[PDB]
Amino acid sequence: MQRSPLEKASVVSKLFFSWTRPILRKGYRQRLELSDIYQIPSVDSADNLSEKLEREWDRELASKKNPKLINALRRCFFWRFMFYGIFLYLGEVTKAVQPLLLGRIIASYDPDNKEERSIAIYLGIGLCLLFIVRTLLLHPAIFGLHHIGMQMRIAMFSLIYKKTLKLSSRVLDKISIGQLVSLLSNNLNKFDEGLALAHFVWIAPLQVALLMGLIWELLQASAFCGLGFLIVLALFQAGLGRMMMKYRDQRAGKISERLVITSEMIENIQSVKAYCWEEAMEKMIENLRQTELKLTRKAAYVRYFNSSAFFFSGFFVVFLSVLPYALIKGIILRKIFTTISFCIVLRMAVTRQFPWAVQTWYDSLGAINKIQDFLQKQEYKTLEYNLTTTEVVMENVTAFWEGTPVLKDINFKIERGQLLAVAGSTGAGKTSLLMVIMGELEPSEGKIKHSGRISFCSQFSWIMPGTIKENIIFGVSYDEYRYRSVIKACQLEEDISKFAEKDNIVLGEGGITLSGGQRARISLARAVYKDADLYLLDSPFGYLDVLTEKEIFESCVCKLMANKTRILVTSKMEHLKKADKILILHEGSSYFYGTFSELQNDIYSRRLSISEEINEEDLKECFWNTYLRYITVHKSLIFVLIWCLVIFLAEVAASLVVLWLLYAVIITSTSSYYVFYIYVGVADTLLAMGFFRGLPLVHTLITVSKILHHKMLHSVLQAPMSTLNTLKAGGILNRFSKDIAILDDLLPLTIFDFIQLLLIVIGAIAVVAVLQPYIFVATVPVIVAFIMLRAYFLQTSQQLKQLESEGRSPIFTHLVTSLKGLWTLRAFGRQPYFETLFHKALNLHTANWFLYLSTLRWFQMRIEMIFVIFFIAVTFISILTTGEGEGRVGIILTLAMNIMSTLQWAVNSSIDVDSLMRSVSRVFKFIDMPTEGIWPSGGQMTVKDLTAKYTEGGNAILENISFSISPGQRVGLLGRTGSGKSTLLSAFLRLLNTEGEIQIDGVSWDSITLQQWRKAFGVIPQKVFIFSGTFRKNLDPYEQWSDQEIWKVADEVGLRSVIEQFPGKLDFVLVDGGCVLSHGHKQLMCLARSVLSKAKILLLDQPSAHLDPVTYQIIRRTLKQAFADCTVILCEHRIEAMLECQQFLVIEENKVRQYDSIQKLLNERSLFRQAISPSDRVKLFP
Amino acid sequence: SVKEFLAKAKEDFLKKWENPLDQFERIKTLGTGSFGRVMLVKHMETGNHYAMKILDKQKVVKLKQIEHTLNEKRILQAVNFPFLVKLEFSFKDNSNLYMVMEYVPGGEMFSHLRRIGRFSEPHARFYAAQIVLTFEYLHSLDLIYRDLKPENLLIDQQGYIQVTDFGFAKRVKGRTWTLCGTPEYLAPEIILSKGYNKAVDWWALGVLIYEMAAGYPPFFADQPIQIYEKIVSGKVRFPSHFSSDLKDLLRNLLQVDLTKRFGNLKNGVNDIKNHKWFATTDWIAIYQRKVEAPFIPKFKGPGDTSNFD
Ligand SMILES: O=P(O)(O)OP(=O)(O)OP(=O)(O)OC[C@H]1O[C@@H](n2cnc3c(NCCc4ccccc4)ncnc32)[C@H](O)[C@@H]1O
Ligand SMILES: O=P(O)(O)OP(=O)(O)OP(=O)(O)OC[C@H]1O[C@@H](n2cnc3c(NCCc4ccccc4)ncnc32)[C@H](O)[C@@H]1O
Ligand SMILES: Nc1ncnc2c1ncn2[C@@H]1O[C@H](COP(=O)(O)OP(=O)(O)NP(=O)(O)O)[C@@H](O)[C@H]1O
Ligand SMILES: [Mg+2]
Ligand SMILES: [Mg+2]
Ligand SMILES: [Mg+2]
Ligand SMILES: [Mg+2]
């Protein structure tokens, strides 16, 4: 994309939007390609717009005692808003004076209207240019208002994201990803296009006054009956608006909960597949969809009654204000038609425009005040910066998260260059001490003193989208030698050689492509690359086998960076020997502090101190029977539609019979033509849909969306693992938030309105044509053109709508990846980099959002131009042929345009319906996603020539394996960090593209359905899955056990005093990924789940990931006690864990080797045998 | 009080304005700089240590800066204020010109700024208040300083600022056209070679506060011609650790438009002194140095020069 033509177009061209023609003509013939998009205008860039708003927001904060957010918005846009409002007012005023001319032109078709005819030519000339004036003053103002709304939305979004990065940890627990996604999704498109309606608050009364003054010309004092009726109806509509706002504000709560559950469940699809919980989650989400539907369907009835007032009021307003005048004195038939002509505009002004404007204000001001409240929360205060301290001092520090203090009487001191090793049991406070040092957990007592320049290696490894190189350098200047030394010292070169594109391999969000140890070592390399005073290493040696762990500890920590003052969290009696000071914690208090001896009693030299624009690459990933599939998905909707058509035909027949069959009114054969004019001008009420036909349609159209949502969720949960990686987190959030909110709220009422207008047009034409068939012939050229232009526009508008629909996924994926790395971002200090990335994504969205509005305005201006030219052309021929008596020609031709006055509005509604139908097309694409795919007795298992690869036609990870497991025999699976050892035990579950034969117990794995095959395997995933809910719901999401057998299991795994330390025993609400629990307790929770579900086959992958030996004894005892009779595959790096197993399977160079002895295994590999600690070497060898 | 004090200062300044090397040691050199050098001297008769700024006459005439030196001498004579370094004796020799200034042991603030990296907001505000008072006093006398930079401001024993180097100063009522100064600290109007007035020192104060709070100047580039482009563009991005209040203050001070420049509109100094960022600084007490300094430089006697290079 390049060089937006808007900036370099002429004034006459942009008055008519002729500059958008090339992208319509290139795209009518064949697919709109990435070369056809344009650059964003320079004024519309997110960079120079958020700064322009915050310039005034900071001034408001620093100057006022009671700051309001709506004063920066006012003093940024007020004049340019009012400037278009002024012209929009004369776009309305010129509409109400049309009857003054038109009811005189029609009146001329009468022999005895002597003076009226004599001057009609000048009235026709005056009407000719009034249309030209009216069409020009209206559209540019509306387009400018749309642009102003877009700019306001962009600025507020950028300000909100810039605010987010500096929130305190206290308020983080109150702000989940679902709340932010709901906040930014509910305003993403409605806010831009809603700005055009706000001005009608002050236009509508100034219009009603004018219309009442004009009606006083006709009806004298009797006109006020319609005014009173309309005022009563407006009051009723205001009450309906109150009720509808109530229901929406009540409903808002559950959406965030359902969204966070959905995102957590889809991200961890691996564990859901392994546990076979792919049916419990559907029930959990359905139970929350039920109440949300119960509220939205109740609000829809109020929306219907609010939208139905226009159609029904048409007849009563006219009747009630012209009946008393006729009752007293005889009236001419012409006055009724003139009154109807004014009353149509009065009805539109009162009943349709004003309440929409009032609702627009109630929504916009509520959103602005919500953002204003968001901006005033607690902020993380930065640590003091001082380059000359050379010493870390901690003294008398105690801390509370909110009873028992987390830390109590903690103090230590270390000089430049010293290594201090933190040790202690699980849950003692090891990580919270690093959180206190980093300044996230500000201590209640004491002080902390250091340089303020730190580097952090989180215990939970974090990876954001990009390559390995970009992840390691992490937004700093590239260096050739520093990077090579870092990537070599971490033993990571061994694994880079396996990847196809080496260092440039693209990693997805969360690094799901990589193994555990690879991701941990990438985070370690990122920590090492950063130049800082203090290094905070939070147990990087968790997932690494002893050889690689020992090599990394010797080479990197102790030799490459021997001049830094690093802090290493470790629980091995080999690392404490190398350290200078030892700190041991227990139950939160300090147990020991001193030298190791008392316990028994220049590569990294220094370091010195992005485009905001889309060039070509960023806009690359973005690149009729849908109605039938939507209609036929629900069987009752067809019956409802047939019912509607039956009643429509009955009404049409009755109206035709009455009109064929025909004091207080003066009517003569000379002026009898007004009957059809009055019928056409009042047909809006006779052929309207009452609630007997309105309410069932709205009810069924909402019942459809629940079926669509349930089907989409079911199809997502059944997809094969290979195709789920092609998706992104932002696409999931997009499709479950926006394309479901649209499906519930906007679509039913818009379809209702479109159907109503279409039925009115068809009924009017059908009834009026039968009595004398020449309107139908006279109306063909307009009907044909209104369809030809619509097709020509839609051919490109569909593609533009699709491209805009995919532009908003990067926003959500950036938003979801930002919150996971917040502590790492603030520790490293990379906020401007992520702000620039988010502004780039915003510009990417705006580039596609702008062209859709430009083309829509072009179309809506062309259709009114066609109407104007046909009106002028027909008016001149109508008036020319009134040569002194019985203007037959005009009676037909002028009547032929009152139908088009509403057919144009029906065609305008058709484009809205089609635009909103794109979400249905995007939803159906997810349903069509391909689907994946006592007996256990003993557990004897046999494989033959098993091969596994993650992608079909890809590179094989392992092949040609023929081992055999005896019943009830422990198998110790072993290997280096990254070998295929997890792939071997994942192939038993058939989660990846596999080939071969597995013969568990004698029944071939191909002879059983997947859901019955996979049930026999009890698993402990390496990736612990904790979802929002209660402890009881976490331990069994089926409720098939009740509180006694749960306590009988939880105490074995040492969870007694871990659960009971919370206010709700077995009922505490775990939130935000279960962050309340320590990392060591999550392993015990997974072990408890495995203990509850007694299966004959067990696949334990890293059962003891981080816990120290004093806690590992629990895992040992429960492995020997709870399921001693079951066969288990024990994949683990702990050497002590390979003392119980009696068969071993070592994986090396993509094939397996079997050993039925542990002594023989160590003899054939010297380096591994020489790396184990002496403590285990004397346990193994006698 | 303050108005009467300023009237008295302006009244007594005029009386001194209209009425304008064998007793010195060469123990140390405290940085030469430009034409000449400043050497440390010790008073034989009393023992008080002083500075001694030498100036080259041939370089003065060659560089076409002769008015600068003479009016510098005469101004540094006439002015009297606690935060300005006072001149005691003036020399006139056939080789060079020498001026004796009172010794300031604490050395440069620039060294401390490059040593610590950056000051916290109260630490910056403490010096900002003193600079605001100094500019109020100087502008009350119709003087222009026009060479504010961290390399001109020393630190005394107690920790207060000591202003030196009045070379480019000038007493003027109205408009001036002379171009001079350090490229990052130049205002847009002087860059454009147009007439400019006393408002430039507020731009210098804004850029000084930005540099002191962040550790690096806002408008910074390789070539001087690029720095001029960045200055005339007027576009700047603030770092994360800046508070909203200080951001507003710097946006008002560093504004390109001369008319709406802060400290120039309608009240002169009250727009700045009443700002929210100075809500907790008692001006009357800080004038009389009754507040505790947040940084006290270690001096090891009158002869110690460990703070200097
Ligand atoms: O992982 P290990 O095996 O190596 O042991 P450990 O490192 O020492 O475990 P610790 O991290 O030190 O946790 C120590 C205790 O503190 C509790 N605890 C932990 N997090 C707690 C919490 N969270 C609110 C603050 C918060 C945390 C994360 C993200 C946002 C906000 N609110 C309240 N109590 C929280 C936790 O149950 C523990 O009993
Ligand atoms: O924790 P450790 O220290 O014990 O390491 P490990 O146990 O041996 O881990 P392994 O899985 O054996 O890693 C083995 C190799 O396979 C690659 N690899 C691993 N997982 C990969 C992957 N996953 C996404 C597709 C998928 C399909 C089915 C189920 C889950 C994920 N998509 C693509 N390549 C994937 C990975 O780069 C490795 O080079
Ligand atoms: N009163 C003083 N006591 C002690 N040292 C001083 C004093 N005034 C200046 N100095 C030191 O001497 C150096 C030069 O003095 P200075 O007054 O700035 O002459 P200058 O040539 O005009 N400086 P410049 O224009 O930047 O090149 C400064 O860097 C100070 O460190
Ligand atoms: Mg931990
Ligand atoms: Mg693994
Ligand atoms: Mg000098
Ligand atoms: Mg100097």
Numbering used by the authors:
A (entry chain A): 1 to 402, 437 to 635, 806 to 813, 820 to 833, 846 to 884, 903 to 1173, 1203 to 1451
B (entry chain G): 15 to 34, 41 to 329
According to the publication:
An example of a protein activated by PKA is the cystic fibrosis transmembrane conductance regulator (CFTR), an epithelial anion channel crucial for salt–water balance of the lung, intestine, pancreas, and sweat duct. CFTR gating (opening and closure of the pore) is under tight control by its regulatory (R) domain, a mostly unstructured segment containing 10 consensus PKA-C phosphorylation sites. Phosphorylation by PKA releases the R domain from its inhibitory position, permitting ATP-induced dimerization of its nucleotide-binding domains (NBDs) to open the channel. The PKA-C consists of a small N-terminal lobe (N-lobe) and a larger C-terminal lobe (C-lobe) joined by a flexible linker.
To understand how PKA-C opens the dephosphorylated CFTR channel, we determined the cryo-EM structure of dephosphorylated CFTR (30 μM) in the presence of bovine PKA-C (250 μM) and the ATP analog N6-(2-phenylethyl)-ATP (P-ATP, 1 mM), which supports CFTR channel gating with an apparent affinity (Kd) of 2 μM but does not bind to PKA-C. We also included AMP-PNP (1 mM), which has a higher affinity for PKA-C (Kd = 35 μM) than for CFTR (Kd = 300 μM). Under such conditions, a 1:1 complex of CFTR/PKA-C was determined to 3.5 Å resolution. Consistent with the apparent affinities and concentrations of the nucleotides used, P-ATP molecules are bound to CFTR whereas the nucleotide binding pocket in PKA-C is occupied by AMP-PNP. Although PKA-C can use neither AMP-PNP nor P-ATP to phosphorylate the R domain, the structure closely resembles that of the phosphorylated CFTR/PKA-C complex (RMSD of 0.80 Å over 1,517 Cα positions). The density for the unphosphorylated R segment 806–813 was less resolved, but its position closely resembles that of the phosphorylated version. These data indicate that PKA-C activates the unphosphorylated CFTR by stabilizing the same open-pore structure as in the phosphorylated channel, with the R segments wrapping around TM11-TM12 and NBD1. The two P-ATP molecules bound at the NBD interface adopt different conformations. Density for the P-ATP in the consensus site is well defined, exhibiting a kinked conformation with the phenyl and adenine rings forming an angle of approximately 100°. The phenylethyl group reclines toward NBD2 and forms multiple interactions with residues within NBD2 (Y1219, L1260) and coupling helices (CH) 2 and 3 (Q270, M961). These molecular interactions, absent for ATP, explain the higher affinity of P-ATP for the consensus site.
